[PDB]
Amino acid sequence: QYSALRSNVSMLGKVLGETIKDALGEHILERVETIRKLSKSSRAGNDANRQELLTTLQNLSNDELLPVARAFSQFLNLANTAEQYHSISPKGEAASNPEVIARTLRKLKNQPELSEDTIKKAVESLSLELVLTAHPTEITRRTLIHKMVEVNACLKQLDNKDIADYEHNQLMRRLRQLIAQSWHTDEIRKLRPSPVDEAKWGFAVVENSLWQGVPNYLRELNEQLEENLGYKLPVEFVPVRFTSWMGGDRDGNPNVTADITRHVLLLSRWKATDLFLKDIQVLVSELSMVEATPELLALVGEEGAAEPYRYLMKNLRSRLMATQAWLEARLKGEELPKPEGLLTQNEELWEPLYACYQSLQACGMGIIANGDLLDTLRRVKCFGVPLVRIDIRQESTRHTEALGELTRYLGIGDYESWSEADKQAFLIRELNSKRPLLPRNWQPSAETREVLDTCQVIAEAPQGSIAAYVISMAKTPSDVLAVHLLLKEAGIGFAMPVAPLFETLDDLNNANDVMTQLLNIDWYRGLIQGKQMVMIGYSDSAKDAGVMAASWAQYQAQDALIKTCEKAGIELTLFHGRGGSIGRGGAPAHAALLSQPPGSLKGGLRVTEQGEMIRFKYGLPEITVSSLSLYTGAILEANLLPPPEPKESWRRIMDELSVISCDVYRGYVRENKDFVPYFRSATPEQELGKLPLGSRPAVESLRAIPWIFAWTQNRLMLPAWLGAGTALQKVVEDGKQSELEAMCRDWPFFSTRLGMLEMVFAKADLWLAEYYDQRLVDKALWPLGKELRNLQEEDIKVVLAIANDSHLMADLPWIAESIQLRNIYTDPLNVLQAELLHRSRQAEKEGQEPDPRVEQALMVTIAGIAAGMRNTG
Amino acid sequence: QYSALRSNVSMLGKVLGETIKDALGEHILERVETIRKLSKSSRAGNDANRQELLTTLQNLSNDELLPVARAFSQFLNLANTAEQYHSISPKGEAASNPEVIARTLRKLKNQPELSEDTIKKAVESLSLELVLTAHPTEITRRTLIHKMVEVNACLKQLDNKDIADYEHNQLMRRLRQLIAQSWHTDEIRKLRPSPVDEAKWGFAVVENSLWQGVPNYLRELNEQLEENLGYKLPVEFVPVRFTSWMGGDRDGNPNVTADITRHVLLLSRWKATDLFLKDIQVLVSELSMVEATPELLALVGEEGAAEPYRYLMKNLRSRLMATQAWLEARLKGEELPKPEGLLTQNEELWEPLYACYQSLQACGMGIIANGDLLDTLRRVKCFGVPLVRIDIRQESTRHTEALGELTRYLGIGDYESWSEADKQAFLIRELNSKRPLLPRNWQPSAETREVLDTCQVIAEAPQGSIAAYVISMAKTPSDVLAVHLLLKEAGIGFAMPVAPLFETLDDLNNANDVMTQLLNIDWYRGLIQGKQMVMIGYSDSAKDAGVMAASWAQYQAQDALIKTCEKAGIELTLFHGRGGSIGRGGAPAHAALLSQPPGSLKGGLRVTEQGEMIRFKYGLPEITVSSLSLYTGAILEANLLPPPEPKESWRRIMDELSVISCDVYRGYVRENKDFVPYFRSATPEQELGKLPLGSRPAVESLRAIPWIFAWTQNRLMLPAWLGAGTALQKVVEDGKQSELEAMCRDWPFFSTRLGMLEMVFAKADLWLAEYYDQRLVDKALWPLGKELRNLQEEDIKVVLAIANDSHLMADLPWIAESIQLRNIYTDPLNVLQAELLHRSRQAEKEGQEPDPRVEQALMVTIAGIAAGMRNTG
Ligand SMILES: N[C@@H](CC(=O)O)C(=O)O
Numbered sequence A, B: 001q002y003s004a005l006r007s008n009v010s011m012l013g014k015v016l017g018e019t020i021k022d023a024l025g026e027h028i029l030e031r032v033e034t035i036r037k038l039s040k041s042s043r044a045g046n047d048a049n050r051q052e053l054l055t056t057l058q059n060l061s062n063d064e065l066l067p068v069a070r071a072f073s074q075f076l077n078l079a080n081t082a083e084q085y086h087s088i089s090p091k092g093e094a095a096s097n098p099e100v101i102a103r104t105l106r107k108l109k110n111q112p113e114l115s116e117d118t119i120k121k122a123v124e125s126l127s128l129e130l131v132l133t134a135h136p137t138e139i140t141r142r143t144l145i146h147k148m149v150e151v152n153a154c155l156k157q158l159d160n161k162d163i164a165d166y167e168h169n170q171l172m173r174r175l176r177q178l179i180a181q182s183w184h185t186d187e188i189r190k191l192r193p194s195p196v197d198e199a200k201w202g203f204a205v206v207e208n209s210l211w212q213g214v215p216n217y218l219r220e221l222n223e224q225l226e227e228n229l230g231y232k233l234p235v236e237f238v239p240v241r242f243t244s245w246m247g248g249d250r251d252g253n254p255n256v257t258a259d260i261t262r263h264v265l266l267l268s269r270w271k272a273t274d275l276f277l278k279d280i281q282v283l284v285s286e287l288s289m290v291e292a293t294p295e296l297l298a299l300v301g302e303e304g305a306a307e308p309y310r311y312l313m314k315n316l317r318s319r320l321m322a323t324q325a326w327l328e329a330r331l332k333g334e335e336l337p338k339p340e341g342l343l344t345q346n347e348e349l350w351e352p353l354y355a356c357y358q359s360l361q362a363c364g365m366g367i368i369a370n371g372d373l374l375d376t377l378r379r380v381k382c383f384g385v386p387l388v389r390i391d392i393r394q395e396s397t398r399h400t401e402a403l404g405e406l407t408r409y410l411g412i413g414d415y416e417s418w419s420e421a422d423k424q425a426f427l428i429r430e431l432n433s434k435r436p437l438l439p440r441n442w443q444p445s446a447e448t449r450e451v452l453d454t455c456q457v458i459a460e461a462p463q464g465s466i467a468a469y470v471i472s473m474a475k476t477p478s479d480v481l482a483v484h485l486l487l488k489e490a491g492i493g494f495a496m497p498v499a500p501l502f503e504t505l506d507d508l509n510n511a512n513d514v515m516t517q518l519l520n521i522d523w524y525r526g527l528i529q530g531k532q533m534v535m536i537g538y539s540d541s542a543k544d545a546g547v548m549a550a551s552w553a554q555y556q557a558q559d560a561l562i563k564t565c566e567k568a569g570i571e572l573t574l575f576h577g578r579g580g581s582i583g584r585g586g587a588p589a590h591a592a593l594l595s596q597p598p599g600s601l602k603g604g605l606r607v608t609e610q611g612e613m614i615r616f617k618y619g620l621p622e623i624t625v626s627s628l629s630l631y632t633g634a635i636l637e638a639n640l641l642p643p644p645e646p647k648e649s650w651r652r653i654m655d656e657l658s659v660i661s662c663d664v665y666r667g668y669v670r671e672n673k674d675f676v677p678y679f680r681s682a683t684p685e686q687e688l689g690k691l692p693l694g695s696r697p698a699v700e701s702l703r704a705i706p707w708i709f710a711w712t713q714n715r716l717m718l719p720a721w722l723g724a725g726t727a728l729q730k731v732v733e734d735g736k737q738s739e740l741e742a743m744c745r746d747w748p749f750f751s752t753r754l755g756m757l758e759m760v761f762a763k764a765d766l767w768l769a770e771y772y773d774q775r776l777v778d779k780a781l782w783p784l785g786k787e788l789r790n791l792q793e794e795d796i797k798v799v800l801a802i803a804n805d806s807h808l809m810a811d812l813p814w815i816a817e818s819i820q821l822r823n824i825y826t827d828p829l830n831v832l833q834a835e836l837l838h839r840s841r842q843a844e845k846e847g848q849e850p851d852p853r854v855e856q857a858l859m860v861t862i863a864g865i866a867a868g869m870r871n872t873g
């Protein structure tokens, strides 16, 4: 029963509607109401109201565009907040209810042939690391996280039956205030955000939600272990860590220079000082205890021995205040010797804090220890000094060029011409060399200098600020050895985890070969210290060969690497990229984590949280708890109860599925002559590049994000389904339909794969897709349009047939329902966006000036549409 | 049905009990449980358990005393918080429900012979000014306001039925944390607090409750005017103002020197900058509007004309940050020229803020205007630059000495010997003199210099920092003229309101004569600018002549002054002292404000909020709303519907009552030879002076507070009832009992007076009173003890008889019930305090050292007892 949800959306829409009424017009509200009516009509076949819609939109003046677009965008905004409130609300989906953890724990516990020590060890070895990434379509100048927390609080309070009418009146008064705020507090970036801006949004997510969320997650998790298993993890064990790529990822982004990284690195520390100060203030005042242990008194001895815990907190406050002061100078561009007690490592924070905990426990003040201090202890290890460690990522190709240029300058030869055996020879030689290689005062090209400067920032930064060096486009063993050489030349004192990123079908296919050669080099083996971390690029390989082939390729590569590393005694860590079924969030993700080759999470969960899903996965502290709890259950279950190995005939169905699907996908994307011209007309791809959407500067050249995003705006969702159904119907046509059904029933990998198409098919919309062709595509490309649309119609059948259902994502009614709601609310943004694109595109055709009203309205729909559709890849 | 209240106290006591169990013992919990059982028994007649109680207490070791006392004190603490939660809770007494205002407003509205314009004018002329005073028994080193706000929030959330069990578990987890905090976070001042400390507690009350409370009160009040009367007061009208005496009152307090006042004056400004900054941060970020009026754009014109409201807030932020910086230097003792934009006046804050409001309204952003800005606009006028204006107060006697010393130094004569006609002559002469009088570089005595220095601080401070100069002990017209002379010599540019404080029966009796002579002097008349403000000292006159005579004297004096000023065309402002029926809080206060001579609140409500009642009247923001709402209703009703004038025979019953009562009261307090010796034995009076309770340094010499407080600890409540009943029974005995009953039925002054004895009789406790005599008083004084106790037994009868009831404060069941609960919880503190006093008093007798454990336990009971008993005078 989704009645409460329906009530809330209606309510919020009434207050929003009121606000627009007050604000500036009843005219705009009529505009809005006419467009929905007319669009609903047109869809239901009325071809008279289709004309009326077309003339209605063409008659909108440029001064109506933005308000209309914002209007539609606001209603969608209210729907998602109603939707998200419902999810954590105990009388609704209840996402954050601690049973999520307990259900997993009970299942494990009463499973024969599962020793209790086996379960304990899996618990003690848990590890999660969530890597935040930028939001591709964040359209405003300042983060709205905190406002959202407030709107949700107001809804929580109104949920209480028995609320005295005066309280209700008060609550509604603030609610009205808050909605008016957003209608009138309009901010629209005029210029492309910068890596620092994006890095800043990530700090907003940390302070408005992760800061409270992680410790609550850790408290609940701990209560559940004791209740169900009979023990609590030790205080020193904090299995969660947050990392960011913001200001760390330079892959394809000129604007993320070594200077910016240096800066962002600095800012994080400034912000950790900001948040750590608030924690310590509280502690300085609340720890008025005077009873301490011999050991703790020793640690202060006299002076502050009459207010011991307060002493240690007072010291740290100063030490934090000192380093704060230092970093604001550095941020300003002022160089000045660093203070006596500058903070650089988490141990410097941990140490004293842990001292208090111990004496408080020892001395009978357990409940005080396990309160605010415990929360601070865990934030120390979860976020610490750097607040959020960053990851650096550059293409392999750029490292080759840096090293080629170097070698020709030195007269040694030209590294980018040598065979791969030669490069390894050269790299192992130099890696063992005690004489330097990088010329004292050199004059390389801009590019090369950037490569060199960035390793200098890495080297310069305090150990533990940078999590890893990711090599996008890794193809050979020399690609990994290359960055180790550069880091050595940059003077690095510690071992920095380097990770190849295989993100193509063939790279995926060669991945296990690439790593066994690497593991065979004794020098390499001893440098990683029994730990490797690979990165699987599902999203980019999917752009390469289609999702089915991509998926199967990934399945196979992880299975081979798990095995190879096991032989070799290396603790493998699979690093997951963006989207896919692992980035679905919620139940589907739990399913997806469990549907990976056995071994797969033995070395932890490390994932790239997609930018556009942060609100939906970590948007509020309770959603954070849900998300971390969901994942934690998946780790323990996947490690204690792995999926079965596929039957050999299944493997053969996958090979063939994979071939047919890749074959059909490339047929259109690469081989077909009309595609590109089609693609640039039917989707807003070109304009996604021009507008100020991401920090990167304004089919093989494109990147996954822009590929996926452009097709989602169009509503066809092309990238996430294309050859899958076609190959599946063909296998059905050989009478192997019952094997397909067994695979689905018995092989997690396969149901999960099939699951994922349904959701995509659930959000896709062929009426809208066709609407864009009619408004934006030239008549000669219409045939391709219908062709691709009919391909999809036929693919839902086969999938529905294999799944033995008639509705579409029938095992997930809440998600199905939530998709249904957003789909109606997103509807008119798509209807309006087609008019914008047409207005915008004819101005340029008529060699005219980019009207700011038309572009800003366009930017609103793009962000609206992206918000309603969430994950589509 | 007080079931929910009973549940909550039980719950909180269980968690507290748990906490002591964990903490350090089951032994202490046994100690606690034994004392209650044994004390309940002993009271119910069991004279075997009375022996057992006496031996039980004597056997407590000094290491058990404090924990036991704290224990009992904590339970009482939880009861008051349960009690206070209940009061504002909508499913309980509901103190803050806006109907309080509406009921008054409806009554007025449908009252014939009450023009709507008459009501509007009374509304537009409302005025309240609450003067905060120090808390006589604040025992800890840091304010606990904020913790209390939290405990109450936890209780609010648990009140919601339908709370998911996980939420309940979470809530209880914090609740446990918070209770443990207080059990273990023990602070006990070791040394007398200082005026700055006391001034600091007042800032805690302002930020934790008044800051939110005043604007909410103003919002509710405004919603109610529009709903019931059809109009809202204008934005510029903020009828409430908070003032403090902390660091302003030197009456009898050496430690409040001109230096300290200077300091406190400075600190307030520092704190207003602190709180005003938080308001402006919010505004700087939320006012992103770009549409402004001609006028507003003009005010910025270019530069910030692309972010206008944000401009003005950014300017003010800087200006605030500037003056903040300045004051922290001055606070430190550093003198340095003051910054360009130093803030000194509320207009400097008001101006810009009001500019935004106007354009926001003008431009269609009404809802944004009436939100956070409106809250800041009202705090500007309510608290402003100084945060809380202070009042200065010195005795008249000290001004005489300053001026005598001056005059003998100058060879002019000796002012403190001249008749009163001469002094006025001298004062009017000098007040009109253009030649100075105060010697350029003089050498007076310490005292005189203090008097001179303080007027210098007054003069030096920015206009609007000081509300008024109060003259305690004012007896003649020269007393008021004296301070005007001194202020003139101190160089003062504005007219400073001076107020005589009549606080004796004869001064009260002469008060109207004193003011008509003052008003007859043309010079004086033109200097006050049609405004005088008198201060009535009910509490001290009661110490002089007993409560009945005091009350009647006050009634008569206000009636005469109202009349005199009306003739003369002067807007009189009665300033109310401490306690009495006006300081009862809640319903009784509303009754009491209404039972004052007609005219009485025409010039506003100005009251001295008693220190020990702040938690109960302004402890939380919703209690603030209740308190201000209650008072506001009383003002409008008292001004539009005054009480009837007393029948002449009533006036004659009052005269006689007054005489008999004063006669019996002085018989004991002054005339009786055993009283003083009795008094110092039976009450903890001597120890209230020695211990570090107030900031003042360690029967006629005593002050009201210490008089009242000492008798409240003893439980006899002597000061608040003594001769009243005795005179009343005597008048009954002449057969005038039916006139007494008509007076009560028809004369508000009289029922109110009678009401007030009941409450006192309700909290008094003759079993305990007698217990202290038995443990602390020498056998020869026992007779006086019983005599005074039997006096009270007989006084309840007569009062009950006149009131036509059998229970005691039967018209107020909630207050009756709440008194009943606190009485049981206070019970054991009184039982323990007798043991402490005996232990403490024999140590000194045995010329021994003040054991710190015995004194600290004693300090806990004193504060406990004072907390449970609230207002007793
Ligand atoms: N995350 C959901 C879709 C959504 O909630 O937008 C899914 O993977 O099906």
Ligand SMILES: N[C@@H](CC(=O)O)C(=O)O
Binding pocket: B584, B585, B588, B759, B815, B818, B819, B869, B870, B871
């Ligand atoms: N203020 C109440 C007593 C109390 O609540 O303690 C009264 O004047 O009766």
